[PDB]
Design a binder for these strands. Structure first.
Lengths: 75, 185, 100, 141, 62, 66, 144, 142
RNA sequence: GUUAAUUCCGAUAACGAACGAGACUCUGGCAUGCUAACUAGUUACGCGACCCCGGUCGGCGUAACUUCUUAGAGGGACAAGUGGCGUUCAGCCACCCGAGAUUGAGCAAUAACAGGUCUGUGAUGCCCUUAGAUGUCCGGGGCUGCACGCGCGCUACACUGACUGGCUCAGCGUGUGCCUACCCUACGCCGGCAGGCGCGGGUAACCCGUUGAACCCCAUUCGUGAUGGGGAUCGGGGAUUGCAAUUAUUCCCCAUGAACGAGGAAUUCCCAGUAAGUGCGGGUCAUAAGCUUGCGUUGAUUAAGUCCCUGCCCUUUGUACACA
């Protein structure tokens, strides 16, 4: 009935609004990111590794079934 | 650390129970602190041995329902463990306190029964079990056929049930089961 | 000289009375005696339906044979062994004597 | 230093596979890239260098116990045979996929055939086994 | 109709059709003298407090 | 239900009326006193009879028994 | 990379069968009949093709390198046990047939079984279970 | 010096694990590998209650090696939690006073009683007419 | 009055008794107390291999020991001790101490069904055939047949998950046949695999085996898509047993990829290692587990009450029922 026509690869706007507002959210996980950005979970998971390299998100707890990310340190 | 224990990293102390009726039936402080929500068992043997079981273990033991997940406490402990950082990285307070606040606000006071239904007040033990139960199945239904995982679903509702914003599944049935009892009383 | 004697019997106390009887017989001749080694038993599980036909409720038997074996080692030639082993033996016990 | 019992076996398998990268003389079979690893598997592995990973995983199995044969390697590398509509049962692994590993481990000297058959790991194979064990314990400190 | 607290002082017996409720003689922690009778679901010991929405409804003695 | 049957009770009645000086108060002694003076086929009944004897002991120093 | 590349392929019209660009390369081939999850994976290793990308990024010249392995497996040393049609009935060819010849190949052997009047052909004629299934309790939905 | 060797057995549903105390340094290993490195890793801190709730200084003079076989995984971890707590209890009873042994025991008494007294829970036999020890097959009427 | 109990106490025109229940047999659990172990291990000695005195090794031979392995004799638990309830009798609840303060199964009374079995019998009354046999044996088929309904079951409807790797653990057992022509397996090669070929071990605490089981744990892919869920139907090929597989005996590979989005009326089983999940032995087996019988792993929610329903056991009552 309700078909989730998720987005496979990032647009210019979606990649722009991933670099700015995502480091404002307190909770970043690939489950909610694929839900909120209206994108695939493969694209959601692949979006979060470079932010860890770019220094915009922090990993605190990684696991095979769930990985969780947050903002940068407030200081 | 023979003096104090840390539930992974969470404090044994400074968890407060608001309603005084449920403080004897919530086992979180000064005698029931454990490093894991897993233990040997034996608390299901006697009638009233159930009350002193730690509530994190009780929520864990009430979690592996619906068939394929039965007898899988090794993975539901993993679900509970990750679910506490989600509370600390959404609200920012002690997840033990948020779980405690979810029990009080999801537990109905009175409930109707066949004896034409007459409304009778529930036991403080009965209020604990039903409040635990309503917030657990909602995570089961929210994680069913959805991108959102089971670990997030546990942390969503008990945060919502702590504040009672009528968006958790546990809050709505708590309102309805007392609204029905309020009618035929 | 290293002689093995095998003590197999279906009854528990028929095997137990003869396993100590060879101890009493051999200690009179006062030679090197090893203790009786208690090895784990074998039990015979047979489960069959009680009804001769296939009619009625489904009930099952539990038919069992526990068999025990005891090994006692002797440091003696076969002259001493052939004398004692013919004294006070009962058909419930099957005795096997190995010279090697 | 320490032995491999002080080193976690999860990241030990590709640390020894990295030792198999710098050697590069395992004389791998032609059918590495196109074979199914067992009859209870249905598809090919995602990791390409599974032969260099299983051979590294085979060496740590032979250090703990010796005398292992072809049938023993199929037993440990077996798994559930999901029979589909039928109930799932345990199945043995493929025979030649473990036979070529022990043949690869005897090509370059890492294993020797023990008495009464089997495969046991050579002392020099244990000697460099401790060096990769000490390089991980020093890394985690 | 404020929320009130009711503290169990002694139990009376099993009530209901299936024995699903426990009739409990209950005391109030707000005042010691005034105290009523109410049927309680679930297993109840001595030394626990209930949460009645109203204190004006009293269960009959069977 | 830990209710003593007639076989345990009637066996304990004859012991008291014959061995008043031999019987004690604690369970373990008159367990061994009744071991020699009674042919009890099993240890379970030996504890049950001696245990019922000890319950009849508390009735003895507190007055008469019917 | 993480952003969209140039030259979009969403539907790959390959051997008159649509292939979605939304799915991965390793499993978008499977929509073609005659190739499944297994036979598509080996083709990604016969030619040096990375399977970690999507089916809307790979370039147009080397997708010709992919499809020549479909109908011609033997010169790219694909073994005979990956093939749907081993030892063909007429010409005895060990080959893989892909979603268009596949159903052409499917309708000789049915009336090849019909013209021989074998039992295996007859069960297909009345639409009964040919592999030896019990029809007393099952087989009700399509037959009213 | 003197051989202060104490060998203490631990039992469970099926898993049996025997510790081996000796007068040595403060290292703990089971089957040749330490307590930190055991899969499943969900239950890491369960191996630590004998260590954390009694202190590392109590294990400084005692080294232990545990041989483990039988049962399943969680049986084995629950075997080696309680096998090593009883191992230190017997060491401080035989060679030194139990005044020190009773004050480490009552810490384990108040926390969890499985560390010293084993659970006598075992799997009862399955009966005929049912798939389990209590459950029966689906009774069909008519 | 009490109990699981016609279990006892106590009354008493009833007394003395008998079967049954209980008692009794097996199993579980606690004893660094006894006996014993070179087909079981532990601890020490001496080496070997490796790493920086120490650590590991199912790598090697020795002396002590039964803590871990086994089975034998004994012991232990009795409402025994305490606080209450109770005629203070029968007994009941809670607590200390203690591995247990109700383990599970076996056996099971009088009378009855016209319950089922003559297709288990060299168990059989009576009736029938008996030479062109309803007797023996051989070839083929069938009992599986398919517009439909019903019963016991296995697999799914997925993200608590599917897949790919790596990690890591069990106990019941069983195994070479009087006829019998047919065993379980180590190890070394060939083939992707099914499987094919060589040598040995084990008549079995010796070999399988230290039973390298699933489950579990860790790390990728998939991304809510009837999707890499699901595997029904079906095509092509390759192997085993058998004299013989087509109506596909089974096993292996590729391919086809249906319904099914948590199931109405109604209904089944269960409260502690229990349910449920999950695998392993045995039976039928030349070829053989969706069944059944046991074993083992992970392992709970609920309840410690009731006659509401379904029923069962006594007492009173009424009956025009007595194949009730």
């Amino acid at each position: 009935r309700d078909k989730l026509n998720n987005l496979v690869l990032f647009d210019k706007a979606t990649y722009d609004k991933l670099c700015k507002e995502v480091p404002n959210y307190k909770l970043i996980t690939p489950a909610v990111v694929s839900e909120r950005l209206k994108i695939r979970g493969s694209l959601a998971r692949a979006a979060l590794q470079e932010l860890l390299s770019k220094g915009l998100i922090k990993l605190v707890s990684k696991h095979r079934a769930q990985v969780i990310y947050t903002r940068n340190t407030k200081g | 650390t023979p003096d104090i224990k840390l539930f992974g990293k969470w404090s044994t102390d400074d968890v407060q129970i608001n309603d005084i009726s449920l403080q004897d039936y919530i086992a979180v402080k000064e005698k029931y602190a454990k490093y894991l929500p897993h233990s040997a068992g034996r608390y299901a043997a006697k009638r009233f041995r159930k009350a002193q079981c730690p509530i994190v273990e009780r929520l864990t033991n009430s979690m592996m329902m619906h068939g394929r997940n039965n007898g899988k406490k090794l993975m539901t402990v993993r679900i509970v463990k990750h679910a506490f950082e989600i509370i600390h990285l959404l609200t920012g307070e002690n997840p033990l306190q948020v779980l405690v606040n979810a029990i009080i606000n999801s537990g109905p006071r009175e409930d109707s029964t066949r004896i034409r239904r007459q409304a009778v007040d529930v036991s403080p033990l009965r209020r604990v079990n039903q409040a635990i139960w309503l917030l657990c199945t909602g995570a089961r239904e929210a994680a069913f056929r959805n991108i959102k995982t089971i670990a997030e679903c546990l942390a969503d509702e008990l945060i919502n049930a702590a504040k009672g914003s009528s968006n958790s599944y546990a809050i709505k049935k708590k309102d309805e089961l007392e609204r029905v009892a309020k009618s035929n009383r | 000289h290293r002689i093995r004697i095998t003590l197999t019997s279906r009854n528990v106390k028929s095997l137990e009375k003869v396993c100590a009887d060879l101890i009493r017989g051999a200690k009179e001749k006062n030679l090197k005696v090893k203790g009786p080694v208690r090895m784990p038993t074998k039990t015979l599980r047979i489960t069959t339906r009680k009804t001769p036909c296939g009619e009625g409720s489904k009930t099952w038997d539990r038919f069992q044979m526990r068999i025990h074996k005891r090994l006692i080692d002797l440091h003696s030639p076969s002259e001493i062994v052939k004398q004692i082993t013919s004294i006070s033996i009962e058909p419930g016990v099957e005795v096997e004597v190995t010279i090697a | 230093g320490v032995t491999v019992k002080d080193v976690n076996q999860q990241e030990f398998v590709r640390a020894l596979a990295a030792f198999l990268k710098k050697s590069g003389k395992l004389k791998v079979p032609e059918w590495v890239d196109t074979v199914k690893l067992a009859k209870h598997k249905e598809l090919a592995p995602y990791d390409e260098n599974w032969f260099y990973t299983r051979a590294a995983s085979t060496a740590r199995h032979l250090y703990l116990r010796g005398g292992a044969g072809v049938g023993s390697m199929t037993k440990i590398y077996g798994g559930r045979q999901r029979n589909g509509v039928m109930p799932s049962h345990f199945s043995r692994g493929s025979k030649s996929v473990a036979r070529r590993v022990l043949q690869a481990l005897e090509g370059l000297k890492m294993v020797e055939k023990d008495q009464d058959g089997g495969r046991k790991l050579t002392p020099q194979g244990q000697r460099d086994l401790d060096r990769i064990a000490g390089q991980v314990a020093a890394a985690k400190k | 109709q404020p929320i009130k607290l009711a503290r169990v002082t002694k139990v009376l017996g099993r009530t209901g059709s299936q024995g699903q409720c426990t009739q409990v003689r209950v005391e109030f922690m707000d005042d010691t003298s005034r105290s009523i009778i109410r049927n309680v679901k679930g297993p109840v010991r001595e030394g626990d407090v209930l949460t009645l929405l109203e204190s004006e409804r009293e269960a009959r003695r069977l | 239900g830990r209710v003593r049957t007639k076989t345990v009770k009637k066996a304990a009645r004859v012991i008291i009326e014959k061995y008043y000086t031999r019987l004690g108060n604690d369970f373990h002694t008159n367990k061994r006193v009744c071991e020699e003076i009674a042919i009890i086929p099993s240890k379970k009944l030996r504890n049950k009879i001696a245990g019922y004897v000890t319950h009849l002991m508390k009735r003895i120093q507190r007055g008469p028994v019917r | 990379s993480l952003v969209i590349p140039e030259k979009f392929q969403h539907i790959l019209r390959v051997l008159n069968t649509n292939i979605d660009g939304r799915r991965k390369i390793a499993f978008a081939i499977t929509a073609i009949k005659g190739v499944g999850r297994r036979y598509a994976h080996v083709v990604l290793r016969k030619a040096d093709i990375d399977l970690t990308k999507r089916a809307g990024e790979l370039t147009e010249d080397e997708v010709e390198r992919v499809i020549t392995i479909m109908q011609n497996p033997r010169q790219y040393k694909i073994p005979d046990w990956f093939l749907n049609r081993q030892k063909d009935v007429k010409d005895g060819k060990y080959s893989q047939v892909l979603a268009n010849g596949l159903d052409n190949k499917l309708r000789e052997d049915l009336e090849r079984l019909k013209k021989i009047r074998a039992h295996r052909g007859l069960r297909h004629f009345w639409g009964l279970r040919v592999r030896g299934q019990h029809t007393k309790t099952t087989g009700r939905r399509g037959r009213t | 010096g003197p051989l202060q060797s104490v060998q203490v057995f631990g039992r469970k549903k099926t898993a049996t694990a025997v510790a081996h105390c000796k007068r040595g340094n403060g290292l703990i290993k089971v089957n040749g590998r330490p307590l930190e490195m055991i899969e499943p890793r969900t239950l890491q801190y369960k191996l630590l209650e004998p260590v954390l709730l009694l202190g590392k200084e109590r294990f400084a003079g005692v080294d232990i090696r545990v041989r483990v076989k039988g049962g399943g995984h969680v049986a084995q971890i629950y075997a080696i939690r309680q096998s090593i707590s009883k191992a230190l209890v017997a060491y401080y009873q035989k060679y030194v006073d139990e005044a020190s042994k009773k004050e480490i025991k009552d810490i384990l008494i108040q926390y969890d009683r499985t560390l010293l007294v084993a659970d006598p829970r075992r799997c009862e036999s399955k009966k005929f007419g049912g798939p389990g020890a209590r459950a029966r097959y689906q009774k069909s009427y008519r």
